[PDB]
Amino acid sequence: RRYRDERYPTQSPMPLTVACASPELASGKVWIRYPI
Amino acid sequence: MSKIVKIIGREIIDSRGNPTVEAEVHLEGGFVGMAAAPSGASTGSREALELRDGDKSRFLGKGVTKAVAAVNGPIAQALIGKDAKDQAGIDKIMIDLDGTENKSKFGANAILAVSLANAKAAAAAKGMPLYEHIAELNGTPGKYSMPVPMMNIINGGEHADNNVDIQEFMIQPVGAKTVKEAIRMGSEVFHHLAKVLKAKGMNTAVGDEGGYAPNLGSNAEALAVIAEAVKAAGYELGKDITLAMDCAASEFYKDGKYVLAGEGNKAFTSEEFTHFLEELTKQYPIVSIEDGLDESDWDGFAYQTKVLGDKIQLVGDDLFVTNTKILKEGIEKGIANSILIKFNQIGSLTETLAAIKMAKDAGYTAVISHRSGETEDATIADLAVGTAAGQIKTGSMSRSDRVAKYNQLIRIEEALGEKAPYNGRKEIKGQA
Amino acid sequence: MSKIVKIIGREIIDSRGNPTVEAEVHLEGGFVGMAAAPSGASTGSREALELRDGDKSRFLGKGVTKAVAAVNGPIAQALIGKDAKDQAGIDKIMIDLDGTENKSKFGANAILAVSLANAKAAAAAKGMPLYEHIAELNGTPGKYSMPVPMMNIINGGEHADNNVDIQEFMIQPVGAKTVKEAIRMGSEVFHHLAKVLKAKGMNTAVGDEGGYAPNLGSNAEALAVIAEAVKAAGYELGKDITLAMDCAASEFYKDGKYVLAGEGNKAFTSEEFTHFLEELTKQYPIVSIEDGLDESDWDGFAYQTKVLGDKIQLVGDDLFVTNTKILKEGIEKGIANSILIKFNQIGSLTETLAAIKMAKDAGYTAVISHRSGETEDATIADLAVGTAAGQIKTGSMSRSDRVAKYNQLIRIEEALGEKAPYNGRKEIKGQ
Ligand SMILES: [Mg+2]
Ligand SMILES: [Mg+2]
Ligand code: NA
Ligand code: NA
């Protein structure tokens, strides 16, 4: 199987208007710290 | 919060200076992912179509404005409002809209860039890294490993203008206990190899994959100077470091014969080349040989699998082109025992996961791979970890088109710790 | 208002296979920035200290665990709770806590990685790209340009093991109307140069900066094969494409004389080398020469600036090491007319902006630069755009340690359009 949790963010806390606002975030080389 | 609201394609530049496709996928909640398509040089004849423009007034004809327009127009429009978390559903929409078996309408470079950018955006929408999302897509949540890398530190064939016919000569740091330690060992051997080469007056400038591109007296001399660098760096060949090769033999298969141009056009039948390779595996701890014969030489590959398959990992690259239809026939015919996974050979993440799963189920190993033309993108690091493939091929320890993947592996291992073991030598088919 | 909550340093690998420092700055609310320090090979003697471990059992002595420990320990503790938007205050805390003139306690590589990661995190907290935040930090909001690139397509000196003593031979696509078109022009010339070189039986493997590293009959022959590639690519030398050089002459200055080892140890006085360079600019449209004399040869540079400065952009690199205290003396002594801006020569974004401003105020140009040891980081693209510097030096059109900066420039220009003009030739001092 595959597990199903309590889940996900409703709105990204770091919205980029375009991906070059943060290449690192958009390419997936650095991650937001959750929670908060 | 995961519906696609915007997709942008654009023409960027790859590590050889040629254009390729980049895509950004934006979701309603503000989540974003970005990815690029890599590009091969020794491309198999059955790879999905890399669509280029052919306009000689731009990039010597290598522009990708048509694929970029496919991303911005028909593809994006077909995906607006769809759920990015439904990766199989996103890829099916694009595959069906293109409507050709080899993705020749939009280009595999267009479809793949969107496929990968979508998976990254969905992962962000789920508040998790790509490798964790990939494990969930794969039906194996929380199952990770750090891959054992094979590192191409002497480049030949289509990747360098030297007299070396074999494409790639690689070291594998099987003795390391972490991928971070593996990366340091590879760097040290790579730097000692420079000193070994200089002392012989050989060239230390690098080819397409960041390995040295010297001229050699024979193809086998590459193994000798590498073994020599391993010893000078203080490691034990065969215990800490094993060796792997990518012949790309389709590139020197002429008129039913394998011809080593750098060795005075020395010619081999299929059987003769297999025994030439066998003798090398007795002189050196070569435990993996990729594309040791031509992509069409299935009878030859059957014989090579009888002679070497019980002791050597035999990796199909051009043989299988990351394509389940072809890998399936190879499994049923007892051809090889490993597959090189290049997602731009097939064109979507979903089809790539299918090839990895098909290999695992048959007991073949899967080696996640870059192309010779790369970008700063590091998606394959996340792919290798999130499918626990066990092995990765992503270049020498120089040029950031290679090292960006090693750096992403370092970050991932730092985040996962013991949840992503580095299993070492036993990942390799035939090793325990 | 945008408080730092966590700072992480780690040892990653640069484009040569050597360790360097990467830093992440995390803010409350989740904003994150990440950057890495580049590493020079031809390092000037007055550059801020790049701190390495010296442990011969790791990376042949080039590990950076001490610098990474500074990021994770003393630097992180000093910055938790501080406002990431106060870039000058953030940099001051790190600089003062280090307390040494050359940043030898923590390493300029530790401080720089945090400095840049912090600016990226602050930009995210403001919901804007780094180039836009940098322009606000600079006191010139909304003022942008796309830089004219000088592209190093034949590598020599310390960057390749060939017989070429001159470090860098560069093309500049001044005829382009956008940086996107400039990048294509450079790609086309770069690919035509490979054909030119193979037809002469010369090596087309690449050096540290992505340019070809052939052995040549003389240093000046690099200009000849580049001129052939420009023509074969269909462009007009001197109108579509001009030429630039980085001699890195501090690397071949021996016993008061400049010695070209690849040309049989041909020796020049400072005067003679200046006139050797002058003659090349009459044979070829060379409009920029970097480090044409040794970093200590200020008498020589004063003479070279009087002889060539009205006509040629003269770029101090090791001469100034991105250091306002040194640049200031140069301006007052009539030394050079341009500065190469390398933020790891000084170690912080705030000190880098000060060098750029001091150059512009004096009428010198500023050229934003990579180092020969790079990562996939593309911070200098945002820096050149966000300060409207006008020029960038970020390598040949191969290797993603160079091309990632070109790709970021393409993305930024797409986003900004006419708000970031490509001004072409007139960016270059003397044009
Ligand atoms: Mg291959
Ligand atoms: Mg320089
Ligand atoms: Na070759
Ligand atoms: Na040299």
Numbering used by the authors:
A (entry chain C): 813 to 848
B (entry chain B): 1 to 432
C (entry chain A): 1 to 431
Quote the study's own text.
For E. coli, the key enzyme of RNA metabolism and riboregulation is RNase E, a conserved endoribonuclease which forms a large multi-enzyme complex, known as the degradosome, that incorporates the DEAD-box helicase RhlB, the phosphorylytic exoribonuclease polynucleotide phosphorylase (PNPase) and the glycolytic enzyme enolase. The C-terminal half of the enzyme, which is considerably more variable in molecular evolution compared to the N-terminal half, provides the scaffold of the degradosome assembly. This scaffolding region is predicted to be predominantly natively disordered, with small linear recognition motifs that interact with the canonical protein components, RNA and the cytoplasmic membrane that consequently compartmentalizes the assembly to the periphery of the cytoplasm. A segment of the E. coli RNase E C-terminal domain, encompassing the binding sites for enolase and RhlB (corresponding to residues 603–850; hereafter RNase E 603–850), also bears two arginine-rich RNA binding domains, which are referred to as the RNA-binding domain (RBD) and AR2 (arginine-rich region 2).
To explore the structural impact of enolase binding on the adjacent AR2 element, the enzyme was co-crystallized in complex with the RNase E segment encompassing the EBS and AR2 regions. Well diffracting crystals were obtained and the structure solved and refined to 2.0 Å resolution. Two enolase dimers occupy the asymmetric unit. In agreement with earlier results, the segment with residues 822–849 interacts with the intra-protomer cleft of the enolase dimer. The cleft has 2-fold symmetry and the EBS can enter the cleft in one of two equivalent orientations. Notably, in one of the enolase dimers, the EBS is superimposed in those two orientations. Although some broken density could be seen for the N-terminal side of the EBS, no features could be resolved unambiguously for the AR2 segment in either of the enolase dimers of the asymmetric unit. Nonetheless, some portions of the AR2 peptide could be fitted to the density at low occupancy, but it is clear that this segment assumes multiple conformations. This suggests that the AR2 region possesses significant flexibility and does not adapt a single conformation when enolase is bound to the neighboring EBS.
